[PDB]
Every structure is written in structure tokens, then in C-alpha cells.
Design a protein around this ligand. Sequence first.
Ligand SMILES: Nc1ncnc2c1ncn2[C@@H]1O[C@H](COP(=O)(O)OP(=O)(O)OP(=O)(O)O)[C@@H](O)[C@H]1O
Ligand SMILES: Nc1ncnc2c1ncn2[C@@H]1O[C@H](COP(=O)(O)OP(=O)(O)OP(=O)(O)O)[C@@H](O)[C@H]1O
Ligand SMILES: Cn1c(=O)c2c(ncn2C)n(C)c1=O
Ligand SMILES: [Ca+2]
Ligand SMILES: [Zn+2]
Ligand SMILES: [Zn+2]
Lengths: 145, 546, 48
Amino acid sequence: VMSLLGHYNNFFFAAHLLDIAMGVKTLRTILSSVTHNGKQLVMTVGLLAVVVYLYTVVAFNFFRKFYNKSEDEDEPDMKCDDMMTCYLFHMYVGVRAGGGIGDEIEDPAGDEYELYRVVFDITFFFFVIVILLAIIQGLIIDAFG
Amino acid sequence: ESILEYFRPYLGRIEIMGASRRIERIYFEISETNRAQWEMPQVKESKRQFIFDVVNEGGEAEKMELFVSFCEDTIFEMQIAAQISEFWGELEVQRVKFLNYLSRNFYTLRFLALFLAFAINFILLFYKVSDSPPNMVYYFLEESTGYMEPALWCLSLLHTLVAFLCIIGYNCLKVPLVIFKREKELARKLEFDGLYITEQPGDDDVKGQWDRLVLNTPSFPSNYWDKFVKRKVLDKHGDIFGRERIAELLGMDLASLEITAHNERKPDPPPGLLTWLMSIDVKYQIWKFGVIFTDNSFLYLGWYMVMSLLGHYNNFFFAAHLLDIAMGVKTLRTILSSVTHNGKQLVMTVGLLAVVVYLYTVVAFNFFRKFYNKSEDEDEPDMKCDDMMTCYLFHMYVGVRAGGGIGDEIEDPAGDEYELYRVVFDITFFFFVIVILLAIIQGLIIDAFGELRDQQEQVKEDMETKCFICGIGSDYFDTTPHGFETHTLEEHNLANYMFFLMYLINKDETEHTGQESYVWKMYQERCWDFFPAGDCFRKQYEDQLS
Amino acid sequence: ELRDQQEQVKEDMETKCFICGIGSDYFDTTPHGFETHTLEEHNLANYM
Ligand SMILES: Nc1ncnc2c1ncn2[C@@H]1O[C@H](COP(=O)(O)OP(=O)(O)OP(=O)(O)O)[C@@H](O)[C@H]1O
Ligand SMILES: Nc1ncnc2c1ncn2[C@@H]1O[C@H](COP(=O)(O)OP(=O)(O)OP(=O)(O)O)[C@@H](O)[C@H]1O
Ligand SMILES: Cn1c(=O)c2c(ncn2C)n(C)c1=O
Ligand SMILES: [Ca+2]
Ligand SMILES: [Zn+2]
Ligand SMILES: [Zn+2]
């Protein structure tokens, strides 16, 4: 099917590069280590979605003004004025950030919620970034075993 | 051949040590009801859990102790399941139908509550805030369908009701096992240890200090198979430590026991509701509530109640019910079990993290103080390390979370008399706090996956290589083809020992055969010599070829 | 490393006698044979 569709659009022949994964044996074993605990990996990213949403429900209610992504004071761009876009912001930026969510939002210094936001960002970093991605790395680490 | 094939399921053979230390084989009948209720899947799950607990958590001398304890509470489970199987009299019969239905469908109600939590949170994914009506904000469930707010309100009511039914179903299904375990342990400790007669328990042992409430209650051995543990304690420790003291401690009436020995009228004087208010035992009920309200599972379900109720106060409180999957689906339970296996190690590691980051704070405040500038406005400098509290806060909040060390979040140390000192400072911060002390955090759970690895592999291997009862390795049995398969399907089968205990209990005491009376007397005496240990029929008779 | 060290020590205590070195696969032929052997026959506290 991909060979035929490659005549419709020439870039469809790029999908045939994955044939090496079903080809050379060592790539088969590397992918077999990745896919040995595939159900565990899927449930781990499901837990990731759940905990990130649990951080979203507590960022919307309390830490709402901090999610500013606009330097233009005329047109603020609150990214957590709505559940859908706040959850999208957390899943897209906070998970991929090197630190937690604390490096992608407003500085919590000089505020009545300073300590609360410090706890918020530190626990986000500790549970979502260093723990819940170490599980993702550890499933395939153990699969090589 | 036809007779044997028809009675193949009901013929159970076991082997006991017997008198003169000769392994003897015993044949008996398993009723269809016993076999069916034993093959019921909940009992299968309980059996696998018990097998893991024995093989993994250890115990070689107490293995038969633990096996027989498993036998007792499994028999209690099958009694409970048989009980729950599908004006005042009308109320009582409708009530017991309701409780039995809840107890049967407890797990489906748990799944239903999880599904409702997901639905409510999916609705909450459309919440939005505006200052205008749908300095003071307004939360409205922005939606295009037009039915979503009524759906939310109906689903909230349904969720609270389902959670209530989960509480009631748990209380009527799994609580009797907890009570049975507690009273069984108390009876054994009273009769064979005298933990309240001769050897009082410690002050910090809250379990031992709490059990004193139930000693003198008239209904102590309820949800327990024997009811004469009080009389056995009186006959055992009465003549040493004092019979009258035994009576006072156990709430016993010495004359009344002897009069109920010879005459025991059994009427039902009060027919009304007032008998349920009068015959209730307040002290025993207080003890029972103390037992359940400390159980982990019931406290979790009670917190499920509390969050369900608070969700009506604020709808976002229903998000806390999403964590129910962690106590729900088994694979998430195992992932969290790897995380929590080394929980103390993780907590001490982050304690060491706090200590070393503070040790960097005391040396950044004294020397590298001017560098902690976070203000480009030269008019108003914002020194973040002019105070211990804010400098430690800066280090813990920014320096730990930075991709590099603290060196990428402060002033450039180039062109300064402390250039080399700050380079050493940032490099050692990166090397000790970032790459080492977070690798320990990752490594504890990395190694915990190896923990659960080797536990499951060890359990499965131990089942594969050695018999659970006799302990003889399969390298002996497999000499004959399928020798170990035969040994653990016919000769020594723990399901057959299940069925033997059940059959002894069911059979009339005057009708026991000689071997059954032998096994029965050491079941009551609690002497596990009859389990074949280190020997079997095949090993016993080799010259005669079994 | 520390994993396998603690596990090896505990396993070695569980499977073989510290003094005589005879494995528990010999003693456990008699019920509680290894327990008896390391509580009565060969006990390092008794050699103390
Ligand atoms: N005395 C014993 N009684 C029962 N099983 C024993 C005994 N000794 C060893 N075993 C091993 O226990 C294992 C139990 O696995 P088995 O296949 O019999 O369980 P199952 O019927 O699938 O159980 P479940 O329904 O709990 O999953 C068997 O492979 C058997 O070799
Ligand atoms: N000759 C021996 N002397 C003592 N112990 C032995 C000997 N051979 C093997 N062992 C094993 O040593 C183990 C020591 O554990 P044990 O439970 O006796 O220690 P303990 O009394 O708890 O010690 P401690 O107070 O040091 O913690 C026992 O499980 C026993 O099987
Ligand atoms: C050991 N044991 C039990 O385990 C038991 C019992 N009756 C019920 N059970 C469960 N009896 C009479 C008994 O002696
Ligand atoms: Ca008889
Ligand atoms: Zn056997
Ligand atoms: Zn020895």
C-alpha cells in the first residue's frame, strides 16, 4: 500500500525506511526490548496524563495569573484561563521542560502564594520530571535485562 | 474404569506423617459444592496472594502455620460467599437482599465509581473563568451541547451514591474477614501465650492495648469458629493465676456456665425492634469500630466518601478520585509499588539533598554574594542571597531544577578575583547535586524494578522446582516421567489439604476413621507434625517401587 | 553491589551452616533439621 501511494506522493516512500526494524536482527532486538514492556509504558504515560491533570486542576484554581505568555501588556495571553488550554499547556510545555513547570511561568517571588508555588513547582519537578520519566527510562533499562 | 473416571474429581488423596513416622495416604470425598467454591476466581486470587506471601516474605518453620491460617480464613471466605449467594419481616428480608446484592457486586460498583470519576473530570475539562457573569471571577462550564451542566449535577449525585454503596458493600463483605483475623489472633495469644494472663503486652503496642476492650464482652468470639475459647483459657491458666481473676478478666460467670452446661433454655422473648437496641453490645461495637477504622482499605474508602461529598461543595474536588486507578488497575499498582518499595531511601536521599544544598548556601552567602542578582533594573537590585532564608530558597528552588548547576542562573564569574573559586563551586554543585544526587533518585526506582523482577521470578521458580508441602526437589521426582507433575497433582496437593480440613469439619466426630481422628486431634491441638516434611510416599517405598 | 552482598549473606546463612558447612538440603530431611542443627548442635553463641 505504501509502495503504491508513493506514486501518488513521492515522500510516502519514507515509510519504507522502517523496514530495517523488521530487517536487521540487532534492530529487531533493540525494538524488542522497547516493546517487551509496552503495556507498562502505556500505563505509565497514562499515569503521567493523570498526574499532570491533577496539577492542572490546582493551577487553574489558585495559580492562574502566573500563566502569562505575552510580553505585550495590551493583549494578555493567559494560558490557564480554560481547562482545555491549561491542560494542553501543562502536557506540552511542563513535561518537556528541563525543569518543571516553574521555569515556564511567571516568577513566584514577591507574592502571597510564594511558598505554595515553590511547593507546586518542586513537586511537579520531583514527581513528573525526575520520577515519572525515570520510570519510562527504567522500563526499557530493565527490558535489556 | 467408568466409575473411577466419574469419581475422579471427588476422590481426594493426601499424605500424612502418621504414627511411627510412616507416610500414609488418606482418601476422602470432596463435595461438588466444596470444589466449586474453591475454584471460584476470588479464592484463586487469594491463593496466589498467599503463595507469594509465603515464598517471598520468608518463613520456613512457620510455613505450615501460615498454610493452616490460610486454610481457616479461606473457609471463612467460602462461608461468606455461600451466605451472599443469590412490616418488620418485610424490612429485614428486603434489607438482607440489598446487602447481599451490594456484596456480590462490590467490584462492579468500584469500577462504576471509577468510570463516573472519569466522566465527571471529562466534563470538568470544559470549565472556564471570566470576570463577566456567565475583581470577582465567575466559573462557568462553557459548552455547546447545552446539557453538560445537568449532566454534571446528575453525575455528581450518582457518584456519591455509588461511593456510599461501595462503603456498605465493603463493610458487609470484607470486614468480617478482618474481624475473623483479629479475633483468631487474639484467641491464639490468649490460649497459647497468655498475653493478658501472664505476660502483659507493651505500652506502645496499640493493638494489644486496644484488644482489652473485647475480653470481658459477652460476644467476644463472634465471626470465629469456636465459641469456647473463654472456657479453654479458664481451664488452662485458671489454676495458676487465679480462676476468679480469669472470670473477671473474661467477663465470665462461673455459676452461670455450669448451669448452662446442664440446662439451656433458648426462647425469643422480645419480638419487636427494641430487642435490637437492648441486646446490642456497646463495648464490643466500640472495639469492632476501632478495628475497622484503622484498616487501610476502609480508610481509603472513607476518604473516597469525604472527597465525594466535598465535590458537591466544589466540583473540582472530584479530580482527587482519578487516583483511584492507582489502587485499581493492577499494573499501575505494581509501578507504584516499585516507586514505594524504597520510599524511605528516597526520603532520606532528598533529605541529604536539602543538607548539601544548604551547605552550598552557607558558602554562597559568605563569599559569592554579589553574583546572585536577578534584576536587570540597576536602580532596584534584587539580591537573592542577602538573607539565609531567601538564599536557601533560591538554591533549592532554582539550582536543583536547573539543567546545569547553579552556574547558569547567576552572574557570570568571568573577570573576578573569585573566578576559579566560583568555577569550582558551580562544577561541584553540578557534579554532586545534579548528576550524582538525582541519579540516586532515579537509581532507587531503577533498582526497585529489579526488586519486583526477582520476587516474581523467585516465586515462580520455587513453585517450579520444589514441592510446596514436602519440599523435596523436582530433581528427585522427575526421575519417573512427569514425576513432579504427578507429585503435585495427586500426592501432595494443597487444594487436597484444603478439602481434607473441610471434610473433617463437616464429618460427624463419632464417624471419623482412625487416621482422620489422628489428624483432627492435632488440628485441635495445633501440632503440625502430620504434614509430610522432607519425605513422601515415593521416597518411603523405593525398594517396593512405590 | 550492595543488593547482592546483603542477599548473598542472608542466603548463605539460610542455606548452609556457618560452622560445619553442611548444606540444609541434608539437615532438612528430618523436619526442622536445619533449625535444630543451628539452634542446638552447632551454635556460634555456644562456641562463644
Ligand atoms: N503441593 C502443591 N500444591 C499445589 N501446587 C503445587 C504444589 N507443589 C508445587 N506446586 C506448583 O504450584 C503451581 C500452581 O500453578 P497452577 O497452574 O496449578 O495454578 P492455577 O490452577 O493456574 O491457579 P490460579 O487459578 O490461582 O491461577 C503448579 O505449577 C505446581 O507445579
Ligand atoms: N552455627 C550457626 N550459629 C548461629 N546461627 C547460624 C548458624 N548456622 C546458621 N545460622 C543462621 O544464622 C541466622 C542468624 O539469625 P537469627 O535470627 O538467629 O539472629 P538474631 O538472634 O536475630 O540476631 P541479632 O540479635 O544479631 O539480630 C539464623 O537464621 C540461622 O539459620
Ligand atoms: C480448625 N477448625 C476450623 O478451622 C474450623 C472449624 N469450624 C470451622 N472452621 C473454619 N473447626 C471446628 C475447627 O476445628
Ligand atoms: Ca466411630
Ligand atoms: Zn510434596
Ligand atoms: Zn553446623
